[PDB]
Design a protein around this motif. Structure first.
Motif, PDB file in Angstrom:
ATOM      1  N   UNK A   1       2.752   8.691  -6.500  1.00  0.00           N
ATOM      2  CA  UNK A   1       3.346  10.021  -6.286  1.00  0.00           C
ATOM      3  C   UNK A   1       4.415  10.263  -7.372  1.00  0.00           C
ATOM      4  N   UNK A   2       5.280   9.268  -7.629  1.00  0.00           N
ATOM      5  CA  UNK A   2       6.319   9.321  -8.676  1.00  0.00           C
ATOM      6  C   UNK A   2       5.692   9.513 -10.064  1.00  0.00           C
ATOM      7  N   UNK A   3       4.658   8.755 -10.434  1.00  0.00           N
ATOM      8  CA  UNK A   3       3.989   8.940 -11.733  1.00  0.00           C
ATOM      9  C   UNK A   3       3.438  10.378 -11.920  1.00  0.00           C
TER      10      UNK A   3
ATOM     11  N   UNK B   1      -2.291  10.515 -14.119  1.00  0.00           N
ATOM     12  CA  UNK B   1      -2.643   9.068 -14.080  1.00  0.00           C
ATOM     13  C   UNK B   1      -2.942   8.540 -15.498  1.00  0.00           C
ATOM     14  N   UNK B   2      -2.623   7.272 -15.849  1.00  0.00           N
ATOM     15  CA  UNK B   2      -2.938   6.719 -17.166  1.00  0.00           C
ATOM     16  C   UNK B   2      -4.452   6.734 -17.442  1.00  0.00           C
TER      17      UNK B   2
ATOM     18  N   UNK C   1       0.835  -1.214   0.000  1.00  0.00           N
ATOM     19  CA  UNK C   1       0.000   0.000   0.000  1.00  0.00           C
ATOM     20  C   UNK C   1       0.873   1.269   0.000  1.00  0.00           C
ATOM     21  N   UNK C   2       1.883   1.343   0.875  1.00  0.00           N
ATOM     22  CA  UNK C   2       2.823   2.488   0.930  1.00  0.00           C
ATOM     23  C   UNK C   2       3.639   2.579  -0.360  1.00  0.00           C
ATOM     24  N   UNK C   3       4.227   1.460  -0.781  1.00  0.00           N
ATOM     25  CA  UNK C   3       5.001   1.342  -2.027  1.00  0.00           C
ATOM     26  C   UNK C   3       4.160   1.778  -3.257  1.00  0.00           C
ATOM     27  N   UNK C   4       2.882   1.385  -3.289  1.00  0.00           N
ATOM     28  CA  UNK C   4       1.916   1.740  -4.335  1.00  0.00           C
ATOM     29  C   UNK C   4       1.659   3.243  -4.328  1.00  0.00           C
TER      30      UNK C   4
ATOM     31  N   UNK D   1       1.123  18.043 -13.259  1.00  0.00           N
ATOM     32  CA  UNK D   1       1.217  17.115 -12.118  1.00  0.00           C
ATOM     33  C   UNK D   1      -0.126  16.975 -11.371  1.00  0.00           C
ATOM     34  N   UNK D   2      -1.136  17.775 -11.706  1.00  0.00           N
ATOM     35  CA  UNK D   2      -2.461  17.772 -11.082  1.00  0.00           C
ATOM     36  C   UNK D   2      -3.580  17.312 -12.031  1.00  0.00           C
ATOM     37  N   UNK D   3      -3.847  18.062 -13.107  1.00  0.00           N
ATOM     38  CA  UNK D   3      -4.909  17.821 -14.084  1.00  0.00           C
ATOM     39  C   UNK D   3      -4.888  16.473 -14.813  1.00  0.00           C
ATOM     40  N   UNK D   4      -3.738  15.802 -14.964  1.00  0.00           N
ATOM     41  CA  UNK D   4      -3.646  14.520 -15.706  1.00  0.00           C
ATOM     42  C   UNK D   4      -2.474  13.633 -15.249  1.00  0.00           C
TER      43      UNK D   4
END
Length: 32
Positions: free
Chosen positions: A15-17, A31-32, A7-10, A26-29
């Motif tokens: 956060x890295x992505x 995530x894939x 869970x922490x690693x995920x 870094x806010x609006x998009x």
């Protein structure tokens, strides 16, 4: 969640992505 360290690693990988999408947004998009 699922498993303690996973869970922490995920969340840290999540956060890295978004930190990688920073040159576009870094806010609006962030995530894939």
């Amino acid at each position: 969640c699922s498993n303690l360290s996973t869970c922490v690693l995920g969340k840290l990988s999540q956060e890295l992505h978004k930190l990688q999408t920073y040159p576009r947004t870094n806010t609006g998009s962030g995530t894939p």
